[PDB]
Amino acid sequence: ASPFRLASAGEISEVQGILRTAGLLGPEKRIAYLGVLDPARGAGSEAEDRRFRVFIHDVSGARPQEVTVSVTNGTVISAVELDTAATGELPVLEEEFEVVEQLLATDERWLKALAARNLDVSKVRVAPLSAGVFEYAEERGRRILRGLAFVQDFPEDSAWAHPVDGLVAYVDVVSKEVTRVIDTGVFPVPAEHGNYTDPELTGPLRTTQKPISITQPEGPSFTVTGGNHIEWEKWSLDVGFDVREGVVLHNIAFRDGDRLRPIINRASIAEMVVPYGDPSPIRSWQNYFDTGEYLVGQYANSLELGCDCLGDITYLSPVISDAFGNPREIRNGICMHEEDWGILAKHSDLWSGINYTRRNRRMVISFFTTIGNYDYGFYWYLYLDGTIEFEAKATGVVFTSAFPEGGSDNISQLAPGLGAPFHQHIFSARLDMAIDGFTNRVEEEDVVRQTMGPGNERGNAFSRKRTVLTRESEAVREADARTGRTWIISNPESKNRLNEPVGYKLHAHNQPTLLADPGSSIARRAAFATKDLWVTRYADDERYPTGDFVNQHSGGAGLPSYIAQDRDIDGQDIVVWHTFGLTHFPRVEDWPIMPVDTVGFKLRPEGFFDRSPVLDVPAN
């Protein structure tokens, strides 16, 4: 029924048929990306027009195509040919992962490099990594993958423990040619293993941990209807899933008594980049756009009950397409549950004798993905008081290198001879704002200190100032933790009872943004990451901060281009793009396996309600 429901297996199959039939699907055609399209903001619209967008790659070498299918009608709406050298390459196919190792295994240059290091080629794993865009003119138009080797001493051995520094290969995965093999020098291959399940390393396991049981004897307080529509403690929303973004949230609204008030139209992590700060040519090109180039949604783990999600869990098993258009289900790929969150409000009043205490709760919508060495958990939380929060959790095994003799200013030692190059994990949350509807605007609020003098004789006064961002060319903002800078999104035509425009305030963590030199390739390709907040006029084709085809795209692809339009954002349909991330200088405690590190942001009601929206929560 709902046009926001999750894609069905049936719908994926139908897309396959429709493609085949029109000749768009054949023998050397691989589906690099396939995902349902969101409704077009119309009124009654065309009853229900479920459209899917597909990126189709051609194994032979023929030009790829961007095609939009209509499943309800069974038609092909568009089918454009893509000039990848112009618009960038398509998302890396899962099936191209092995290819880089296989091709290198017969390359005499590779083999020579391995032989000089006394490495058995059958033990050398090669990580198929994105290439980005650097000084290699012969790569433009070609679908390249770079490779870095890791020695795996046996089937269950952790290869990350054994990086082979001083060597890197570039591979054309279409023409199947090893375009280049670079050996800058031999580096000792770290010998210590990092097998965290090897009782020789772990030591005897702890016997001290006693059970903690989180149970809901009467079940959860939230309802799931129409497959992915959630209703919980006045909150209302639809849980979507896209192969590229992962869990996406639609129509986040709050039922303020009678009115179901919209807050956020669509919330998603539209991009996730991991830039490395090691100036060694072996790794200086390394920058993974986990969302844009690899598609974090396809690599979502099947979360196990009790281990990954504890308590009363309600799962969603999204369905994606495989390389040939067949539907694949990610069983238990999404966790939905409500968890206790301490004290919500408390006051023991002397004068009244009333002692009041209420407990908080947060609805949780999460998924965990695995991209090579890292694993990331994406968590969305809705709180009783109207707060919306996102939190990313980074784990996995660190990406290793050799630790230079003489130390390093760009790499840290994890174990003898083992290094961990400096890097960052930068996210972009795309928030299609709908504060009490689509007529919104954003203001930058700074704390204002005042000078002692007339009107402030005791020099105790302090205020706040708000600047409305009116045109897109003024909506590219940076953080200022010092002055407590935040950004408020309000509806200038919807006022609370005190006659103030209803709003929501965005609280960032103010972590550092992209450190790379402004003139670097990564600065140009991931320009969104050089600023904390961007505001754009909504447009159905501006979906990602880095553009639609990130793989090997030259630069300035998304936000910088969109922002160039300089559209009116003062009281219009707008989108807030918040850049936030972690800057990592790995520590010895991050090895052999990294404990979770976290980052995020949140939005709190700012005059949205007429008084506290949690006065009706019972004692219990």
Please give the residues from 576 up to 595 whose contact with Ni ion meets the rule CB under 5 A.
Answer: 584
Contact range with its own copies by CB under 8 A, out of 7-15, 63-71, 183-191, 586-594? 586-594
Annotated catalytic residue: which of 374, 381, 504, 544?
Answer: 374
Q: What sign does the dihedral 104-108-110-112 (CA atoms) show? A: positive
Residues 389-408 that bind its own copies (CB under 8 A): 393, 395-397
Alpha carbon dihedral 80, 82, 88, 89, in 10-degree steps, equals 100
Does the annotation flag 31 for ligand binding? no
196 assigned to active site: no
In terms of residues, how long is the chain? 620
118 binds, among its own copies, Ni ion, none (CB under 5 to 8 A by kind): none
Q: How far is the CB of 272 from Ni ion (least distance, A)?
A: 12
Nearer to Ni ion, 424 or 536 (CB): 424
273, 290 Cβ separation under 8 angstroms: yes
Which partner from the list its own copies, Ni ion, none does 219 bind, CB cut-off 5 to 8 Å by kind? Answer: its own copies
151-190 binders of its own copies (CB under 8 A): 152, 155-159
DSSP 136: -
Going by C-alpha positions, the residue among 598, 578, 487 that lies closest to residue 532 is 578
517 binds, among Ni ion, its own copies, none (CB under 5 to 8 A by kind): its own copies
When the beta carbons of 156 and 540 are compared against its own copies, the nearer one is 156
| Cβ–Cβ under 8 Å, residues 245 and 296 | yes
Annotated ligand binding at 425? The verdict is: yes
The verdict on whether residue 375 carries a ligand-binding annotation is yes
Binding status of residue 250 toward Ni ion by CB under 5 A: no
3-class SS of residue 9? helix
Does residue 361 interact with Ni ion by CB under 5 A?
A: no
- State how far the Cα of 194 lies from the Cα of 187, in Å rounded to an integer: 19
Q: Does 599 engage in binding with its own copies (CB under 8 A)?
A: no
Q: Please name the helix (run of DSSP H) or strand (run of DSSP E) that holds residue 577, with its range, or none.
A: strand 574-584
54 or 599: CB nearest its own copies: 599
Residue 155 phi, psi (nearest 5): -45, -50
Enumerate residues 6+ apart whose C-beta is below 8 A from 67.
19, 24, 53, 54, 56, 76, 77, 78, 79, 80
Contacts of residue 155, defined as CB under 8 A and 6 or more positions apart, other chains included, come to none
Residue 584 binds what, of Ni ion, its own copies, none (CB under 5 to 8 Å, by partner type)? Ni ion
Q: How many amino acids of this chain bind its own copies (CB under 8 A)?
A: 155
Which 313-332 positions form the footprint of its own copies (CB under 8 A)?
A: none
The stretch among 66-74, 81-89, 277-285, 469-477 that binds its own copies (CB under 8 A) is: 277-285
Judged by CB under 8 A, the stretch of 2-10, 14-22, 288-296, 582-590 that binds its own copies is 582-590
155 binds, among Ni ion, its own copies, none (CB under 5 to 8 A by kind): its own copies
Catalytic member of 107, 165, 290, 432? 290
Residue 415 CA to residue 192 CA, distance in Å, equals 8
The reply to whether 291 sits in an annotated binding site is yes
CB nearer to Ni ion: give 505 or 584.
584
In the bound complex, what is the minimum distance in angstroms from residue 248's beta carbon to Ni ion?
Answer: 24
Give the pairing type, strands 486-495 and 501-508: antiparallel
Check binding of 287 to its own copies (CB under 8 A).
yes
In the bound complex, what is the minimum distance in angstroms from residue 400's beta carbon to Ni ion? 11
**Minimal distance, residue 229 CB to Ni ion, in Å:** 36
Q: Closer CB to Ni ion, residue 410 or residue 552?
A: 410
CB 439 within 8 A of CB 572: yes
Take residue 430 and report the two structure tokens written for it: 């795309």
- Check the annotation: does 294 bind a ligand: yes
298 part of the interface to its own copies, by CB under 8 A = no
DSSP H or E run through 110 = helix 108-116
Phi and psi (nearest 5°) for 389?
-140, 150
Give the footprint of its own copies on residues 441-480 (CB under 8 A). Answer: 447, 449-452, 455-464, 479
Residue type, position 207, single letter = T
What SS3 state is found at 556? Answer: coil
Which tokens go with 350? 């002397």
- Nearest distance from C-beta of residue 143 to its own copies, angstroms: 21
User: Is 544 among the catalytic positions?
Assistant: no
**Burial of residue 58 (number of CB atoms within 10 Å: 0-12, 13-18, 19+):** middle
Spatial distance between the Cα atoms of 577 and 18, rounded to a whole number of angstroms? 35
CA 241-243-247 angle, 5° bins: 30
- Euclidean distance between CA atoms 599 and 427, whole angstroms: 9
**Binding partner of residue 175 among its own copies, Ni ion, none, CB cut-off 5 to 8 Å per kind:** none
**If contact means CB under 5 to 8 A according to the sort of partner, which of its own copies, Ni ion, none does residue 83 touch?**
none
Q: How far is the CB of 221 from its own copies (least distance, A)?
A: 5
Find out whether 599 and 392 touch, Cβ atoms under 8 Å: yes
Q: Do 184 and 166 touch, CB atoms closer than 8 A?
A: yes
Question: By CB under 8 A, is residue 242 in contact with its own copies?
Answer: no
The Cα-based distances of 530 to 57, 186, 205, 443 in angstroms read 31, 36, 44, 20
| The two structure tokens encoding residue 173 | 């995965």
Instruction: At 105, list the tokens.
Output: 């295994």
Is 293 annotated for ligand binding? yes
Closer by beta carbon to Ni ion, 547 or else 592: 592
Nearer Cβ to its own copies, position 1 or 619? 619
Smallest gap from residue 130 Cβ to Ni ion (A) = 17
Residue among 47, 81, 209, 406 that touches its own copies (CB under 8 A): 209
Q: Which of residues 112-141 bind its own copies (CB under 8 A)?
A: 125, 134
255, β-bridge pairs: 260
Kindly state the smallest distance separating residue 619's Cβ from its own copies, in Å: 7
CA 23, chain centre distance (Å): 34
User: Cα–Cα distances in Å, from 172 out to 139, 184, 481?
Assistant: 8, 21, 45
Least distance to its own copies, CB of residue 455, Å: 6
Site for its own copies in 519-548 (CB under 8 A): 519-523
Could you say which of its own copies, Ni ion, none residue 129 binds, taking C-beta under 5 to 8 angstroms by partner kind? none
Report the nearest approach of its own copies to the CB of residue 299 (Å). 9
Binding residues for Ni ion, rule: CB under 5 A, are: 584
Catalytic residues: 290, 374
Binding residues: 288-299, 371-376, 423, 425, 584
Binding residues for Cu cation: 423, 425, 584
Annotated binding site for substrate: 288-299, 371-376
